[PDB]
Every structure is written in C-alpha cells, then in structure tokens.
Design a protein around this ligand. Structure first.
Ligand SMILES: O=C(O)CCCCCOc1ccccc1CN(C(=O)c1ccc(-c2ccco2)cc1)C1CCCC1
Ligand SMILES: CCCCCCCO[C@@H]1O[C@H](CO)[C@@H](O)[C@H](O)[C@H]1O
Length: 255
C-alpha cells in the first residue's frame, strides 16, 4: 500500500511525460474546436490542418484514423519504455507486448477524446461528429461506431488521468500475450500494477463500489473489441484493395 503508491506515482509521470493530450485537457475542450460534420467542413479543416494519394472521402478519413493510430502507437511505446519494469524485459518481449496490447490501450485511451456526439482531432483544434463518421460508406463506417459504443460506457466510470495510466500500464504488461518468452516475469509485473490499481481506486474513488472489478471486465471487453476490429481490418484489406494500409499496422495484424 505504501510501496504500490510510489509505483503508481512513477507510472503517472510516465504518462504525463509521454502522452500528447491528457483526459483532463480533452474534457475541458470538449465542454473552440472546428466542427467537421460534412464534406465541405472536412475540406475547410484540411485547407485545422502528407498522407497517401487521394482516393475518396471515406478512404481519406480512414487514412487520417490510420495516421492517428500510428501516432498513438508511438506515444504508447515511449510510455511503456518509461516504465522501468517494461524497459527491463528483453526487447523482443517488449515488442510482443506492444504488438498485442496497443490497440486495446488505444481504444481505452480513445474514450478520453470522445463524447456521445463526436471526437477531437488534430490535437483538439477540431471536433469530428459521430453522425458524419456514420455517413461514410461501408466498411469505414462500421469500424468506427463500435469504438463509440465502448467509449461512452467507459467514460461513465469517470476515470481520471492517474487511473488511466495504471489501467493502460496493466493492458500493456499482460502475461496472456502469445509468444511471450518470460511469462512468469510479465505476469508478476501485471499482478503488481493491478494491485497498485486496486489501492489507487480505493483512495481516488472512495465511493465507487465495484469499480475495480468493473475495470477488470472492461479489460476483457477491450479484448473482444480488438478481436472484432482485426476482423473488420481483414475485410478492408480484402475488399478495399486500393486503400493503403500502413506497414507498421501491417506488422501488427500479420500475426
Ligand atoms: O486499426 C488500425 O490500426 C487501422 C486504423 C483504423 C482505425 C479506426 O479509427 C477510428 C475508429 C473509431 C474512432 C476513432 C478512430 C480513429 N481515431 C481518431 O482519433 C480519428 C482521427 C481522425 C479522424 C478524422 C479526420 C478527418 C475526419 O475524421 C477521425 C478519428 C482514433 C482511433 C485510435 C487512435 C486514433
Ligand atoms: C513499435 C511498437 C509496436 C510494434 C508492433 C509490430 C510487431 O511486429 C512484429 O515484429 C517482429 C520483429 O520484431 C516480427 O518477428 C513479427 O513477425 C512482427 O509481427
């Protein structure tokens, strides 16, 4: 309880140092950004704002998701490396962790910039509506909406940034990942983060009953969210041959 408090402080600093936007700053903005809600406003935003050559509205928007997804893998990688227990693993295990962990963490973190009406883009200087993203053609509308369903429920838990750092540290440092070399070591670290999380919630959310087991179920739900995301990504790679898929995301899905 004493030790695990110090542990959590370090993981929080890892978080504050590496992530380009806190949930704190996102809610404050979300409560002014340029609203993108149709083709004209997307154009004006671009003309708020170097991607692959143009194809069409839905694909262009998918290119922008893809670029932000890659940018977030970057942050998550620096954040992981800022955790001494992560950085102490052999480099191959770090890659295995990030490979199977980042999309779960990405979708967890995504909730911070989402409300029921849309999400922030371009570092908070823009806001893209959910109805606009719903209007894109299949399969680009289908891959977007489920993340929204997840976020609004997740945001009802009202985690702050110090909760999120442990929660995401817990997602990354997961002994379950296929092809781990040193499983007992990663399981041990995961257990520690989870114990630290449990205590942290006790102090930070003293009136929130069931919050810890609530968040453990969200980790199980994120796992299913990502399975469905990869399946949709398989369909896009198969039916949308003219859409470019970033090589880094390719190396992640190839598993
Ligand atoms: O999986 C992969 O690796 C392949 C990529 C598919 C990812 C599916 O993308 C989704 C789905 C749901 C919610 C958000 C996003 C994309 N994101 C955005 O922040 C974002 C960025 C730009 C726009 C935009 C600009 C102009 C008009 O719209 C809109 C949203 C999040 C997601 C996680 C990191 C970023
Ligand atoms: C930047 C952090 C995220 C990295 C995620 C990408 C991991 O890709 C994997 O890299 C391995 C070599 O390291 C290959 O042996 C695997 O075939 C490949 O799937």
């Amino acid at each position: 309880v004493a030790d695990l408090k110090a542990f959590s402080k370090h993981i929080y600093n890892a978080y504050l140092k590496n992530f380009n936007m806190t949930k704190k700053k996102a809610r404050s903005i979300l409560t002014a950004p340029f609203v993108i809600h149709d083709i004209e406003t997307l154009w004006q935003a671009e003309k708020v704002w170097g991607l692959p050559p143009y194809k069409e509205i839905s694909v262009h928007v998918f290119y922008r998701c893809q670029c932000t997804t890659v940018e977030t893998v970057r942050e998550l990688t620096e954040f992981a490396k800022s955790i001494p227990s992560f950085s102490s693993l052999f480099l191959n295990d770090q890659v295995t962790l990030l490979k199977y962990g980042v999309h779960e963490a990405i979708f967890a973190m995504l909730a911070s910039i989402v409300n029921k009406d849309g999400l922030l883009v371009a570092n908070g200087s823009g806001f893209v509506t959910r109805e606009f993203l719903r209007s894109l053609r299949k399969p680009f509308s289908d891959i977007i909406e489920p993340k929204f369903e997840f976020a609004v429920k997740f945001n009802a838990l009202e985690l702050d940034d110090s909760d999120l750092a442990l929660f995401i540290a817990a997602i990354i440092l997961c002994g379950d990942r296929p092809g781990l070399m040193n499983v007992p070591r990663v399981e041990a670290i995961q257990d520690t983060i989870l114990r630290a999380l449990e205590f942290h919630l006790q102090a930070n959310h003293p009136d929130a009953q069931y919050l810890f087991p609530k968040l453990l179920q969200k980790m199980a739900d994120l796992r299913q969210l990502v399975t469905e995301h990869a399946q949709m990504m398989q369909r896009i790679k198969k039916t949308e041959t003219e859409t470019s898929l970033h090589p880094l995301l390719q190396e992640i899905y190839k598993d």
